[PDB]
Design an enzyme around this catalytic site. Sequence first.
Site, PDB file in Angstrom:
ATOM      1  N   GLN A 129      63.015  43.179  59.215  1.00 24.31           N
ATOM      2  CA  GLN A 129      62.472  42.813  60.521  1.00 24.31           C
ATOM      3  C   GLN A 129      63.098  43.645  61.636  1.00 24.31           C
ATOM      4  O   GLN A 129      62.396  44.343  62.383  1.00 24.31           O
ATOM      5  CB  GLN A 129      62.700  41.319  60.768  1.00 24.31           C
ATOM      6  CG  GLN A 129      61.712  40.673  61.723  1.00 24.31           C
ATOM      7  CD  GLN A 129      62.252  39.390  62.328  1.00 24.31           C
ATOM      8  OE1 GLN A 129      62.966  38.633  61.671  1.00 24.31           O
ATOM      9  NE2 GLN A 129      61.918  39.145  63.589  1.00 24.31           N
ATOM     10  N   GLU A 167      61.097  40.348  48.338  1.00 23.67           N
ATOM     11  CA  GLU A 167      60.153  39.469  49.011  1.00 23.67           C
ATOM     12  C   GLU A 167      58.957  40.308  49.441  1.00 23.67           C
ATOM     13  O   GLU A 167      59.130  41.262  50.209  1.00 23.67           O
ATOM     14  CB  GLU A 167      60.808  38.792  50.211  1.00 23.67           C
ATOM     15  CG  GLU A 167      59.936  37.754  50.888  1.00 23.67           C
ATOM     16  CD  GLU A 167      60.070  36.380  50.262  1.00 23.67           C
ATOM     17  OE1 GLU A 167      61.149  36.076  49.712  1.00 23.67           O
ATOM     18  OE2 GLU A 167      59.093  35.602  50.317  1.00 23.67           O
ATOM     19  N   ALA A 180      62.668  36.522  45.845  1.00 23.56           N
ATOM     20  CA  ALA A 180      63.873  35.743  45.580  1.00 23.56           C
ATOM     21  C   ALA A 180      63.759  34.338  46.160  1.00 23.56           C
ATOM     22  O   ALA A 180      64.277  33.378  45.575  1.00 23.56           O
ATOM     23  CB  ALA A 180      65.098  36.460  46.147  1.00 23.56           C
ATOM     24  N   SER A 225      72.362  41.547  55.367  1.00 22.55           N
ATOM     25  CA  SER A 225      71.978  40.153  55.549  1.00 22.55           C
ATOM     26  C   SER A 225      72.648  39.322  54.464  1.00 22.55           C
ATOM     27  O   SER A 225      73.120  39.847  53.451  1.00 22.55           O
ATOM     28  CB  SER A 225      70.454  39.967  55.509  1.00 22.55           C
ATOM     29  OG  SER A 225      69.840  40.486  56.676  1.00 22.55           O
ATOM     30  N   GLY A 261      66.063  37.135  52.573  1.00 21.64           N
ATOM     31  CA  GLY A 261      65.252  37.625  51.477  1.00 21.64           C
ATOM     32  C   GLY A 261      66.080  37.708  50.215  1.00 21.64           C
ATOM     33  O   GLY A 261      66.543  36.683  49.704  1.00 21.64           O
ATOM     34  N   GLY A 298      68.911  39.339  50.498  1.00 20.14           N
ATOM     35  CA  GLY A 298      70.128  39.034  51.222  1.00 20.14           C
ATOM     36  C   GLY A 298      71.287  39.955  50.911  1.00 20.14           C
ATOM     37  O   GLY A 298      71.192  41.172  51.096  1.00 20.14           O
ATOM     38  N   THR A 342      66.622  27.925  57.670  1.00 21.54           N
ATOM     39  CA  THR A 342      66.310  26.736  56.885  1.00 21.54           C
ATOM     40  C   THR A 342      67.229  26.511  55.693  1.00 21.54           C
ATOM     41  O   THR A 342      67.221  25.403  55.141  1.00 21.54           O
ATOM     42  CB  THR A 342      64.858  26.789  56.380  1.00 21.54           C
ATOM     43  OG1 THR A 342      64.590  25.642  55.565  1.00 21.54           O
ATOM     44  CG2 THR A 342      64.618  28.053  55.568  1.00 21.54           C
ATOM     45  N   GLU A 390      85.197  59.661  66.728  1.00 20.60           N
ATOM     46  CA  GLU A 390      86.422  58.979  67.118  1.00 20.60           C
ATOM     47  C   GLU A 390      86.242  57.471  67.200  1.00 20.60           C
ATOM     48  O   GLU A 390      87.243  56.738  67.229  1.00 20.60           O
ATOM     49  CB  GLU A 390      86.920  59.523  68.461  1.00 20.60           C
ATOM     50  CG  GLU A 390      87.049  61.038  68.485  1.00 20.60           C
ATOM     51  CD  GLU A 390      87.474  61.571  69.837  1.00 20.60           C
ATOM     52  OE1 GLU A 390      87.570  60.770  70.790  1.00 20.60           O
ATOM     53  OE2 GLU A 390      87.717  62.791  69.944  1.00 20.60           O
TER      54      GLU A 390
END
Lengths: 450, 55
Positions: free
Chosen positions: A14, A70, A98, A139, A143, A145, A178, A253
């Site tokens: 995304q 996904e 997944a 992540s 998904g 992940g 969720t 640097e």
Amino acid sequence: RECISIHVGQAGVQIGNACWELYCLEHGIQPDGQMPSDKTIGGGDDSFNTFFSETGAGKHVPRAVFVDLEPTVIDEVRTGTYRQLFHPEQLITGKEDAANNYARGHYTIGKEIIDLVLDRIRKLADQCTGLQGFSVFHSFGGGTGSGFTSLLMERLSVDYGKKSKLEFSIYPAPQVSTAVVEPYNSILTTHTTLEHSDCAFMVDNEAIYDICRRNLDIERPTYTNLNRLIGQIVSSITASLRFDGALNVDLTEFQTNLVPYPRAHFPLATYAPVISAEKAYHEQLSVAEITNACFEPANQMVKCDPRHGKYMACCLLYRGDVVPKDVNAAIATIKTKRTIQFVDWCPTGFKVGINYEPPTVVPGGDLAKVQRAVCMLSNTTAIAEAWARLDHKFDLMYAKRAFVHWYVGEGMEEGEFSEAREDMAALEKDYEEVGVDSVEGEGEEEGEEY
Amino acid sequence: DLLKAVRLIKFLYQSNPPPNPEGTRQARRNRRRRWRERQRQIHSISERILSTYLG
């Protein structure tokens, strides 16, 4: 400087498509297919026109490998609002999803495409000689992940050698997501992605939710406004390699003066002089309150007290657009007092980085003509409270044993969770106990630990 | 004669450690005040009583 960009998971893909179209509107990549400023096909070949080079078909396409099992996120990056400006044929879909389960990705559900992503990284790693590292968009569990980032990092550390592994390890807000199991993958992160990496960052989601519900007052408490602001922070960090000039304070640097230690691996971010779309009515353009509200919790991603977190390093960064002499003019504003509690064996001064060429403004969001910025990014021991919060969550969940039988009959081990706990404890004690000033080793007779 | 005397040398003059220059000024000041009371109470009263022991 032609670093390989990996984007897995729903958040990774995304913000990958979002930020790369922000580069498209930044570098002028029109939906025609090529820029109207420079007529070289695909992309340019300047010092800053280096993210876009010749790998695909002679057209210097944007360079980012987009893999996720996904399939709906691959569909909406294939069928979003831009259809040809990304890689025309190099985005390969995923067959089975997944579906919010991390542990399937590392052992069962993501193993069929590890050979394909190895082929993609061998394609994109035998390219032009400039390669300072990896622009990893990490992540945890959305998904796939942490699965593909984890396997990529481990086989990239044991197979590709000792290249830098710059991570954007998002620690998302449980309110907007969720899943509940997320502490398990966030603490396996230390075992499978932290030791074999070489440099990392932090992006967050709680402070953006806090300002969007209370301060910035935008009625969009979802991943879209989070993407809209993390796109700004990704454009801000990539402006070092994207705005070359007299004050091109680039990554070279930067990676030196970020991290001091093996397990001082986790920096902090404090970018919030933001002006909203409902504040976009020719309001005060301030160079004083953006200096005066630095250590207040408004700019901080995680609500921590600066009164207890000692700093072994501090990297100041004021990216404006007005004058290169305003660098000196802002040096002589507020930096003189700065009585900030430090470790007794660290320097004091503040680096300066500006990008005096004005950028191109992102339309259709919650932002005004932003031109100037403040970010006091550094490695702080004040994230010990955040990691203690995560460890409290994991201790409560391990006392509750939620999804343990989900997460043991696929390749994991309870002793593996014990070693992950020890790795998390090492990352704790390099910020909890060793990270504070350890002056109590000189000598005294009271009955202490001799 | 020699018993309490020579064994009091063998203890008390073996009971003087060097100070600690490492550390901040507070603990150094505490060790300095303990030093400047310690050697004064080692030399003064002990050679007073070895002076007026029996002559």
